[PDB]
Paper text:
MPO is a heme Fe3+-containing peroxidase with a protoporphyrin IX as the basic structure of its prosthetic group. The porphyrin ring of MPO is covalently attached to the enzyme via two ester bonds (Asp260 and Glu408) and one electron-withdrawing sulfonium linkage (Met409), and features a histidine as a proximal ligand (His502). When neutrophilic polymorphonuclear leukocytes (neutrophils) entrap microbial or other invasive particulates, they release MPO during degranulation.
Here, we present a new crystal form containing four homodimers of human MPO at 2.6 Å resolution. We could capture the binding of the serotonin-transporter inhibitor paroxetine, which is known to be one of the few irreversible MPO inhibitors, in the crystal structure of the native enzyme. Clear electron density is present for paroxetine bound in four of the eight monomers of MPO. The entries to the four other catalytic sites are obstructed by an arginine residue (Arg653) that inserts between the side chain of Asp384, with which it makes a salt bridge, and the carbonyl group of Val576. Every MPO homodimer has only one paroxetine bound and this is with a partial occupancy of paroxetine ranging from 1.0 (full occupancy) in chain A to 0.73 (partial occupancy) in chain H. The reason for the non­saturation of MPO by paroxetine is probably because of its lower concentration (25 µM) compared with MPO (138 µM) in the crystallization condition. Thiocyanate, in its negatively charged form SCN−, can bind MPO and oxidize to HOSCN, which can induce reversible modifications to mammalian cells that are repairable and thus less damaging. In our crystal structure, thiocyanate is found in the same position hovering above the heme porphyrin ring. The final model contains eight polypeptide chains of mature MPO and 30 glycan chains on an asparagine side-chain ND2 atom, or in brief N-glycosylation.
Residue numbers in the entry:
A (entry chain A): 166 to 272, 279 to 744
B (entry chain B): 166 to 269, 279 to 744
Write the structure that this text describes.
């Protein structure tokens, strides 16, 4: 059973909820907000058996839907005047705090075969594909690991390998073996392990991982730079993400250092926990104070996230299956380059803009092409992409995803849609209904909902009914909320999820007993610009709201102008 | 994939809901309305490991709770002036339409706590069981995902959730074909080939490996019956109702053959089955449930039907399997049999319940079903009172004749809720939007009974830990109902989903013609008894309320029969 008193989070999230102690813990099934919809009722995804209809209509190929609706010419790309690319990157990093859906290891081999045999669910290629002319080819896809393998009885559900809580588990890990390996066990300073072979202008980099089949090595053979080791396994997927992970590692070590000065008699354990506790609170505050309001807009923010009252032990904090797909809205924010800038915020030469298809798993570009400062600068001073109904997502992810390290480039929009079918998620209208929103039955009604009859027509041509529209596709097709970057449906799902992660987290930073009133006063002062200042060689940063500020010099200030975190109230006699 | 058109229910309930076709089908996990509460978070029930507390307090022995709170002296028993014993029996029969939770080696003879056994420990100073090294046998319910460290243990419903008379027809296709008369093209159910009840049909016999009905008598050598549900023989009153509905099927198939001579056996079976199903729905929702819930809760939880809603989940909830056991408080300690003058039928007009369990011989050799049905109609149910919860015939002597020791059904109810990982009273109160008492004083207010509140806190320590059955049946009854607010909410909520989420609900456009629905509105359970037994005087009005001979009785000739005119075809 659970300790009747405790001071800190467990690593796995076990015991956050004392009455049902696995809720929000790692390696458990997702909760379902709606009953699953599988071709055979309990296991096989729609699109599995050729010729089998969904709810009266043919299943559209995920790749076909991507081609006809998501595809757009890259020269048309609209930059978001009101959002930085840091808005995109915080979303990915946050996602990697919340959910990871494990797949079986490459092994019959889904990566090299186009045979549809468990556990493979390859994406078929439509006729007249702009890229893949051989229709006997396919895009690789492994089905998500089931919670109960080989069962006839259970309705297939998938697994979340992370703690659902906003607890910085992407830094500290969600399993105890990994969480100990991430720590510096050389001394009693309560530090996280740092790279022993390289530094970034004197500052720390993430340790290297020891992988059986390391993909970062494939991106540059001569460089011989492996993937990094972090709390989450996807830390090296793009260098912008790596940058944020690195930034938070440093911030942990900085805090543990300052707490050692302040409380000299604290051992390594106490320093680690207390630093971890703060980093967690900082991720909560940036997310709920700065990030989410700009996702949802002010109306939805009031509706779905009213003022915090207190912890409610009857609120289920698990990640919902649908959330893993809906929170992928952020794929519409992705620019087709990685932007690097020098200390004058000027294109850092020789390669200021690297195509995304050449940065995936390219840990070598962090170690050998100037560290994280140029990348963080690019995030702060470049605009996000804007989602528009005829410019949904760029070809660097739709045509060339992981191009360097796979037999064929993937299509992330199409994977989003195959994945929703794999997970047995209901269609657009079922989720509309779940959210208390009107459900369009006809092309005209869908036109009204989308304020776009052209797009409504394309969707009905693919899907036949709005009942069958894949949740991602429908969600991101919707016109955006005032001062937000999602439509009503995604607002509802995302809002609902984050409310539960807050109200049902016993260690929420505002919950009575977690922090003293003076510590909460102090924590209210933190910001992400400040964290960049404290832990990089950057001295000019974005004005608050870092997710909106996107134009040099107009939206920038000196580091000296910003309030630091005062750790005075953490001192003990 | 589901047939895009169909006329009749599948046997398994597959394809009722076309978007999620397993919903309400047989042999699937229960739905959870709340997250499970297990000692280890995912599998072990509270009370499993000695010394491990629940939510700050020791776990009370289920048998101790039964002894201190459920036990009452049988001479104090209060009869319900407003409810027949038929009200009790229809509840059990309906339950056997909705849910059966299957179990799996050594649990029947061993008191060692080793999976899958979860034996009930005996407290000191037990009124009945003096040997503290003994125990009450208990098998844990089967898990949906055996041996998993990942999944939160959930249990299985072997029946169709729908109100579809699956206790008559079966919930699996092998069994459903064996229940049919495949000798001819009349669409009949199989009847007993060795015995009759004054010329009328009895249920076939089952072929069981370990048949308990044989143990009851022994010289009589009468095995258990075979029905849609495996529990048909558990008491003869239940057997009577099963038998009654078998006859009613065969009667309807007969009349439809006259009316439509060119219909084959399949068409007759399905069309008769369709009617019997509608009759079970109508008696349940029109006659039964209003008297369970009372008029307030009935309006709240079961407003006027509109139409089928394919987004309503019709699965049975895990908690319902335990909450709907409220009907154990309605059970009288005798089986009552009456002759055609409604007078004690000799020999043995009142048999102790501990001598009727699995006693199929008493149907075949002691006068058939007419005396039993008469006893149900003309005897009062027991009334649930806070100091008279459940009788010792089920608390002390359950299944005494057919196993090594008498069971305690109230205690099993409570061990079972822990087995299933159900939250305690307050979590369910909260789920229902009801106030959650934290102190003995608040619990006194809620129960309108400070004495009972004190006893419960002595056992449980907090209202958070009170077992759902125990808490539910402790609550004062609603005006003109026989459950409190919490059970009203759970039961009401469940039956609303079974109605609004059933594609084959009898009022749903397209199931029956408008003329067939006019005709079906006329059916009643008294009528069904008339049509299919040698009984000619039956209960008035609301059979579940009518409980006193002659005051509440009428002649069969006074009642309208079911007009099958609108079932005729060219
Ligand atoms: C601590 O947090 C608990 C969880 O709250 C939910 O999650 C949090 C994060 C917020 O988003 C909350 O706003 C959200 O509600 C709270 O407990 C919940 O309280 C509500 C209100 O009393 C309870 O609702 C009641 O549910 C009864 C049972 O029926 C429910 O379940 C069925 C199957 O699950 C489903 O068919 C029903 O639709 C219903 O589901 C609820 O729907 C309503 C509205 O869409 C929601 O408000 C509920 O959250 C849903 N619950 C679930 C579990 O999915 C109903 O009978 C009852 O409504 C009846 O009475 C009211 C007036 O009395 C009438 O308006 C209405 O006509 C109806 O007849 C009510 O809806 C809910 O079950 C509780 N959840 C749990 C886990 O117990 C706590 O209240 C909160 N405590 C504090 C101090 O803040
Ligand atoms: C756990 O935590 C500890 C403490 O925080 C980490 O210790 C650090 O290890 C790294 C790498 O293993 C060291 O970096 C190397 O530094 C040497 C020279 O060290 C000197 O200069 C430092 C510069 O600021 C200075 O801090 C050092 O002072 C400390 O150490 C001395 C002597 O032990 C001690 O007495 C003092 O009191 C201080 O504690 C010292 O003056 C440098 O030569 C190395 O160069 C490498 O890289 C180059 C390429 O640029 C390569 O070409 C070289 O040949 C070589 O490979 C390297 O930069 C760092 O000095 C350590 N810091 C401290 C505070 O001890 C430890 O790593 C953590 N473990 C894990 C797993 O994270
Ligand atoms: C057909 O039936 C559908 C299900 O009906 C339910 O069961 C039947 C038998 C009745 O009891 C009925 O009353 C039940 O509703 C029905 O769909 C349901 O419609 C409601 C209302 O639109 C939906 O509730 C809304 O849900 C969203 C999402 O949150 C829910 O899920 C989370 C996670 O599980 C829970 O924590 C929440 O408590 C919710 O349960 C909510 O965001 C939303 O509340 C917000 O918006 C409303 C309206 O503005 C505000 O009043 C609130 O304060 C919030 O701001 C609602 O709670 C429900 O999800 C939905 N269920 C399904 C399965 O879709 C359907 O409408 C019926 N249709 C017809 C045609 O008859
Ligand atoms: C490479 C990828 C990115 C590069 C910038 C990227 C970005 C984001 C943002 C901005 C997100 C949210 C705001 C976000 C969320 C989630 N993603 Fe996505 N993403 C990249 C790559 C992937 C890939 C590949 C997947 C898996 C696709 C598949 O179905 O096979 C992916 C998923 C997700 C996801 C679900 C996570 C999970 O539980 O497994 C998000 C919530 N991303 N990304
Ligand atoms: C013998 C038993 C009965 C009568 C002589 C009897 C009566 C009822 C009524 C009147 C019910 C509803 C109003 C009702 C519901 C449910 N019961 Fe209960 N019951 C008798 C015996 C049992 C036994 C034995 C069990 C199982 C005991 C255990 O848990 O160890 C039992 C259960 C149930 C039940 C749950 C059924 C399931 O899903 O498996 C009801 C809904 N009854 N009974
Ligand atoms: C088990 O079943 C047997 C029947 O198979 C039961 O035996 C029966 O007991 C009754 C007791 O009244 C006998 O009734 C008697 O019948 C005779 C002849 O008409 C009559 O003279 C007596 O006055 C009385 O009415 C019945 O005949 C007898 N049947 C047989 C075949 O022996 C037995 O009692 C059952 N087990 C029990 C209840 O312990
Ligand atoms: C199947 O149905 C037939 C016809 O309804 C049953 O046959 C009758 O059986 C009774 C007694 O068992 C006989 O006395 C009648 O003379 C038979 N009637 C006819 C028309 O043949 C048959 O027994 C049924 N089978 C089962 C298993 O119930
Ligand atoms: C692979 O990594 C090497 C580092 O090992 C990167 O480049 C090297 O190539 C640059 C390209 O202009 C040279 O200017 C560098 O001096 C050189 N560095 C070393 C140590 O050899 C190389 O560009 C990477 N390859 C690709 C195609 O990106
Ligand atoms: F640890 C993890 C990181 C990323 C994931 C991703 C989840 C979505 N599906 C694709 C997965 C990436 O798999 C890859 C990527 C590059 C490769 C590779 C396989 O073989 C050699 O080069 C899974 C596990
Ligand atoms: C689960 O854990 C138990 C208890 O230690 C172990 O005996 C069992 O073999 C494990 N099984 C699986 C399938 O993970
Ligand atoms: C039923 O008919 C009988 C005659 O068989 C008659 O005496 C009796 O009064 C009728 N009604 C009632 C209520 O018993
Ligand atoms: Ca987490
Ligand atoms: Ca049924
Ligand atoms: Cl879901
Ligand atoms: Cl290293
Ligand atoms: Cl905040
Ligand atoms: Cl368009
Ligand atoms: Cl700078
Ligand atoms: Cl439940
Ligand atoms: Cl037989
Ligand atoms: Cl009705
Ligand atoms: Cl025996
Ligand atoms: Cl009392």
């Amino acid at each position: 059973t659970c300790p009747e008193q405790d001071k800190y989070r467990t690593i796995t999230g076990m015991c956050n909820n004392r009455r049902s102690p696995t809720l929000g813990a790692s390696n458990r099934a997702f909760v379902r907000w709606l009953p699953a919809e599988y071709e055979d009722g309990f296991s096989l995804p729609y699109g599995w058996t050729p010729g089998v209809k969904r709810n009266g209509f043919p299943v559209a190929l995920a790749r076909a839907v991507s081609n006809e609706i998501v595809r757009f010419p890259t020269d048309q790309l609209t930059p978001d005047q009101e959002r930085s690319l840091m808005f995109m990157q915080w979303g990915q990093l946050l996602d990697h705090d919340l959910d990871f859906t494990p797949e079986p290891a490459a092994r019959v081999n889904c990566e090299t075969s186009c045979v549809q045999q468990p556990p493979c669910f390859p994406l078929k290629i439509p006729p007249n594909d702009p890229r893949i002319k051989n229709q006997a080819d396919c895009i690789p896809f492994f089905r998500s690991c089931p919670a109960c393998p080989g069962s006839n009885i259970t309705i297939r559900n998938q697994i979340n390998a992370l703690t659902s809580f906003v607890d910085a588990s992407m830094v500290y890990g969600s399993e105890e073996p990994l969480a100990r390996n991430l720590r510096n066990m050389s001394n009693q300073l309560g530090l996280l392990a740092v790279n022993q072979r390289f530094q970034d202008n004197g500052r720390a980099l993430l340790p290297f991982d020891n992988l059986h089949d390391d993909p970062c090595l494939l991106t540059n053979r001569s460089a011989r730079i492996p993937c990094f080791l972090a709390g989450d396994t996807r830390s090296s997927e793009m260098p912008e993400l790596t940058s944020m992970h690195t930034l938070l590692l440093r911030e942990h070590n900085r805090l543990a250092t300052e707490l050692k000065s302040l409380n000299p008699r604290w051992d390594g354990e106490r320093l680690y926990q207390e630093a971890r506790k703060i980093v967690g609170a900082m991720v909560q505050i940036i997310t709920y104070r700065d990030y989410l309001p700009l996702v949802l807009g002010p109306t939805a923010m009031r509706k779905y996230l009213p003022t915090y009252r207190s912890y409610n032990d009857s609120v289920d904090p698990r990640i919902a299956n649908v959330f893993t797909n809906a929170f992928r809205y952020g794929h519409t924010l992705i620019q087709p380059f990685m932007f690097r800038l020098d200390n004058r915020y000027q294109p850092m030469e020789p390669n200021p803009r690297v195509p995304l298809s050449r940065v995936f798993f390219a840990s070598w570009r962090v170690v050998l092409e100037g560290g994280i400062d140029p990348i963080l600068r690019g995030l702060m001073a470049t605009p996000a992409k804007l989602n528009r109904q005829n410019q949904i997502a760029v070809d660097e992810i739709r045509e060339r995803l992981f191009e360097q390290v796979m037999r064929i480039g993937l299509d992330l929009p199409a994977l989003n849609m195959q994945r929703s079918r794999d997970h047995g998620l209901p269609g657009y209208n079922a989720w509309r209904r779940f959210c208390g929103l009107p459900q369009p039955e006809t092309v005209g009604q869908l036109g009204t909902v989308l304020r776009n009859l052209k797009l409504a027509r394309k969707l009905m041509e693919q899907y036949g009914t709005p009942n069958n529209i894949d949740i991602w596709m429908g969600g991101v097709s919707e016109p955006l909320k005032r001062k937000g970057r999602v439509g009503p449906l995604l607002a509802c799902i995302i809002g609902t999820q984050f409310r539960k992660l807050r109200d049902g987290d016993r260690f929420w930073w505002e919950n009575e007993g977690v922090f003293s009133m003076q510590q909460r006063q102090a924590l209210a002062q933190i910001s992400l610009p400040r964290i960049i200042c404290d832990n990089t060689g950057i001295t000019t940063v974005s004005k608050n709201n870092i997710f909106m500020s996107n134009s040099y010099p107009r939206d920038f200030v000196n580091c000296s102008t910003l309030p630091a975190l005062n750790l005075a109230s953490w001192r003990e006699a």
